[PDB]
Amino acid sequence: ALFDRLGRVVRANLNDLVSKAEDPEKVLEQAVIDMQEDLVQLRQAVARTIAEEKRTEQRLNQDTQEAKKWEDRAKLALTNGEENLAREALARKKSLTDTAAAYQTQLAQQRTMSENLRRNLAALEAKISEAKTKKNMLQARAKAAKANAELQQTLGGLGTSSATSAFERMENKVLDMEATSQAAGELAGFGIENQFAQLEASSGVEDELAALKAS
Amino acid sequence: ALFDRLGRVVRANLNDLVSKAEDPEKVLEQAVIDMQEDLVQLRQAVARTIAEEKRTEQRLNQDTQEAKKWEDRAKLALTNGEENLAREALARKKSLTDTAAAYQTQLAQQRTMSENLRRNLAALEAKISEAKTKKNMLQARAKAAKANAELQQTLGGLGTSSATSAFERMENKVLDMEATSQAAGELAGFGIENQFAQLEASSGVEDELAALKAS
Amino acid sequence: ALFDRLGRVVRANLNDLVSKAEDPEKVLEQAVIDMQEDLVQLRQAVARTIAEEKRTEQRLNQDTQEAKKWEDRAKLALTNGEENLAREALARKKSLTDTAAAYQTQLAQQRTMSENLRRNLAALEAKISEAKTKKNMLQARAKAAKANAELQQTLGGLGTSSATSAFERMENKVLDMEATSQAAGELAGFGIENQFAQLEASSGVEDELAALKAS
Amino acid sequence: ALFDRLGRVVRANLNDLVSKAEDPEKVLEQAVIDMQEDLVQLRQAVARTIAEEKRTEQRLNQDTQEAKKWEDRAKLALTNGEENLAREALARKKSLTDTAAAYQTQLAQQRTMSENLRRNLAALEAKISEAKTKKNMLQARAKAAKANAELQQTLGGLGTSSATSAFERMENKVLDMEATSQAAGELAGFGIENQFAQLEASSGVEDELAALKAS
Amino acid sequence: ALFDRLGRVVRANLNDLVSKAEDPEKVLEQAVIDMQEDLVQLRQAVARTIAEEKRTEQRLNQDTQEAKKWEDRAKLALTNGEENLAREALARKKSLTDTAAAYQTQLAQQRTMSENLRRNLAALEAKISEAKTKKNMLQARAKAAKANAELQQTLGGLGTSSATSAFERMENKVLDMEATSQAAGELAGFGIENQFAQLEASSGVEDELAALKAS
Amino acid sequence: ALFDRLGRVVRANLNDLVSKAEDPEKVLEQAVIDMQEDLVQLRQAVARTIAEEKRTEQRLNQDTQEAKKWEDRAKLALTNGEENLAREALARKKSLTDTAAAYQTQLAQQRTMSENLRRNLAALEAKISEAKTKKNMLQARAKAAKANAELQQTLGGLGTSSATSAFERMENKVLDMEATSQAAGELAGFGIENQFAQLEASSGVEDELAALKAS
């Protein structure tokens, strides 16, 4: 349906605006806080399982302690003489003794669930801890991305160095053109040729001075 | 008949709505209260049986005590002299004595019913008590079911951790792509090749410094 | 019937709200006040049984005292001379004497009920007194539960100590990173290598000073 | 019923507010005033029993004094001569004499009730008096509880002494750090080593002065 | 029917407007979210199949454990002496043992369905994962399409470079036309011909200077 | 009948309006969607045929498994001793065995229908797939028809180029007519003939200059 495609495109445009606003390193801190809240909720469920194991433990010890009570009352009645009453007390002692087995098995059963949820806690603890160390390395990688952007700004500064160097190269071309214009006027008037003829006569006089030193 | 099948389907749909609304642990408390009301009604029936046994007991003792009365009146009349009157009193004593046997047998008969209903009370007491202990273990099992649902929420939190980790992985891919773009521009301009030639000349100078330390 | 299951579920939801509002230690005081009202009602029933025993006692003494009256009137009539009147007075004395036995047996019968209800009072007194001592220990156990919740708050304070220690660890990492950046710039400029060469020359001068002390 | 549990919880919350407002020593004075009002009401009941004993006493003496009147009238009529009238007066004297016995027994009967209520008064007097002495010791114990709270305030003053001593210890650490900084600069400039060489030369001069005294 | 052709043409025009609004890369993210919702619904159906396998497993173990109960009761009755009761208990043990086979076969039957749906889950997992990797390559291809559009903009910039170069070529044609107009006026006045005659006389003077250097 | 010819002409006029509104490429997408709905309906009929084949398969296996049951019961009765009962069980085993053949033949019969409808599905799958590829080529052909209409617009642009070129040709004819009017006035005044006589005298002077260079 075309309305479902338009709703998916609007949700994708909203997600693209969310990614454009995403903040470096702050998202990792928010993930660590969210993992801490999840660990507190998991610890509450583990605590409720441990409380069930403690309830069954208390009931077990209650059963044992009450069976000893019936056992003592049976001996009291036996010493008095009412033997049938002692047999009745022992009969109730048997009921308590047998119920001890059911609560014992239930207790060992709850130990398996306790260990299961404890293993889940341990693995999720590993997950949160690797989140911690991953953030440690990921903050170093995010700083390295900012340093790579600084290296790109140093390369981009080549455009500004080309503007300053091009302005200096234009001023140097104007100075060299003024010097060339003085040399072109001095050559075109014959003055450079007269100076070359005078330099040849000065070289002839230097050769005559070398011969005068040689003789 | 099709109307009986529609009535059974409507009652099954009503039962499915009742199961959807069922509350954890509260149903076990309502069962313990219903077992207490049933035990009070059973105790009232047992009390009526015990009252029948007490009525017959009183009638038995009445018969014995009245027979002693006739026995004494017979001796009074004997000492006076009216022997026939004493024989009449003894004749009534015989009637009372014989009725004692019928009420004695009826009393021992009612003892069997008393013991029957008492055994029923004892067994139903065992039933209610195992209901109590069963609720004790069943509340621990219901808490373990809530803790299993918490472990499923910790596994389901993997989808939210994949959304946070995927947002971090997209930001890391954008930073690594900016660094790769700076390295691709630096290589494509020949600057990475000029830096590799300068690093080879720096390694040659380090080998010359090692030879200068060696000589 | 589905309406009976909905009524039991609504009553269980009301009981769960009552347990959520339950107040520590105040419920034990309300139980002690309710046991005091029940003991006052039981004491009123015991007092009515003791009053029945006192009524029969008064009737017994009345019978004895009246029999003595008839005995004296018989002697008065005997001394006067109307012997038949004295025999009549003695005849009534016999009736009173015999009724004394019936009221005597009834009195000893009421003593058994008095002792029965008195034993019930004694046992329920034991029950209320163990309620008192149980509250004494139970207030100590409720304070120990509040202290266990304080120990859980001291362990939960580890999250706040991790926030303060993590802020200090981030400030220490920033200071150590600034020191490392100064050391990396000093090494990369060759200044750390020049300082290591000067430290080797200072160690050579210290060895020359040790040789100059040795000679 | 859930409304009875909510009423008991509201009454327990009201009792907890009453205990929070409880005032030391003033409650013992209010108990002494309440015991004085109860003793005044008990004394009024004892006074009504003593007034019943006084009424019977007056009736007894009235009977005796009236019997003497009839006895005198009998002698008057005897001396006159109407012997039958004297016998009639003596006949009434007998009626009064016999009624004296009934009121005598009733008086001795009321003495038993007087002594019973008097014993109750004595025991409740012991109760109020032990309340008095108990308050005497209990005011000493309440003052000892206030003195124990003062000893807890003296121990709690250790936190304020740690704040003052910690401020002094920080100022002493700043002064010792300034002295250490002067000693570290004096050692690092070689001045402490020059002073140690001068102290060795001063010890050599002291040994030369000891040899110059020895020779 | 012509109304069905008009409805198909209107739906095709609506689809063409939907394709014109289609957004690059956002549709792949919406497909990954839709595959995650479908995987959650498939996982719920697989979980219901696994719960059916667990129900049958519990019933199987229940049957075994109950058969052991009947086996023990048979030995109790045998040791007591009621042999027929023991044979009855063994008769019920046989019923439980045989039902174990039916639930065993049903359990192994449900394992086949569990594996079937698990294989479907695995294959659809492969489908979603190839969707993930396909999006990875498809985002690279979409960026390459944007870069191809940038290369088309660089070629289209040839029209703007032709406008700037054509304006410079018109200014250069105007300057060259002004120079040509000065040369055409200088030639048409005979001044270029007089300068060519003077350049021929200057070449004759240069040849005379070369002969004067040669002699 | 003339009313049937008028109804056919009205339906043909409605079809001509439908063809005038026909949209390029969108009709091929609507045909692909209509082929998908037809394939879903055909797949539902094929699924009902496969379910009939599965029903017969289950009945076949039921027959085999039940025949084994009767075979075992026959051996039980044989070992017990009731031989006639075993022969009866084998008699029922024969009935089940023979019914197996009828359901076997019916199953192989339904396989032929399954294969027939499966072949129809395969061929219609070929039809829909060639519809897909035909649309692939047909979208390329529809784009080529739009490009042919663009080539017709480029040829039709020759009319607009003739309007611009005709306006330029009229301006060029007006400029050439103004130049011709200046030349016609200059010729008609004799000035062109005087300039031709002066050009002949200038050619005579150029021939005299060539003779002066030749001598």
Residue numbers in the entry:
A (entry chain E), B (entry chain E), C (entry chain E), D (entry chain E), E (entry chain E), F (entry chain E): 1 to 215
Which sentences from the paper describe this structure?
A prominent member of the PspA family is the vesicle-inducing protein in plastids 1 (Vipp1), also known as IM30 (inner membrane-associated protein of 30 kDa). Vesicle-inducing protein in plastids 1 (Vipp1) is critical for thylakoid membrane biogenesis and maintenance. Vipp1 appears to have two functions: in membrane maintenance (that is, during heat or light stress) and in thylakoid membrane (TM) biogenesis and/or remodeling. Vipp1 binds to negatively charged membranes and membrane binding depends on stored curvature elastic stress.
Using single-particle-based helical reconstruction, we resolved the structures of type I tubes at 5.1-Å resolution and two structures of type II tubes at 7.0-Å and 7.1-Å resolution. The type I and II tubes differ in their diameter and the arrangement of the monomers relative to the tube axis, as well as the diameter and thickness of the engulfed lipid bilayer tube. In contrast to the Vipp1 rings, the monomer orientation of the α1−α3 hairpin with respect to the tube axis is the same over the whole length of the tubes. Nevertheless, the monomer orientation among the tubes differs; in type I tubes, the α1−α3 hairpins are oriented parallel to the tube axis, while, in type II tubes, the hairpins are tilted approximately 45° relative to the tube axis. Remarkably, from rings over type II tubes to type I tubes, the α1−α3 hairpins accommodate a wide range of orientations along the tubulated membrane axis from perpendicular to parallel (from 90° to 0°) while essentially maintaining the same intermolecular contacts to stabilize the assembly. The here-determined structures of Vipp1 polymers in the presence of membranes indicated that helix α0 is immersed in the outer lipid leaflet of the bilayer. However, in contrast to SynPspA helix α0 that protrudes toward the bilayer, Vipp1 α0 lies flat in the membrane plane and appears to be partially submerged into the outer bilayer leaflet. The bilayer thickness in all three Vipp1 tubes remained nearly identical at 35 Å, although the inner leaflet radius changed with the tube diameter. Nevertheless, the same or similar intermolecular interactions of α0 with another α0 and α1 + α4, as observed previously in Vipp1 rings, are present in type I and II tubes.
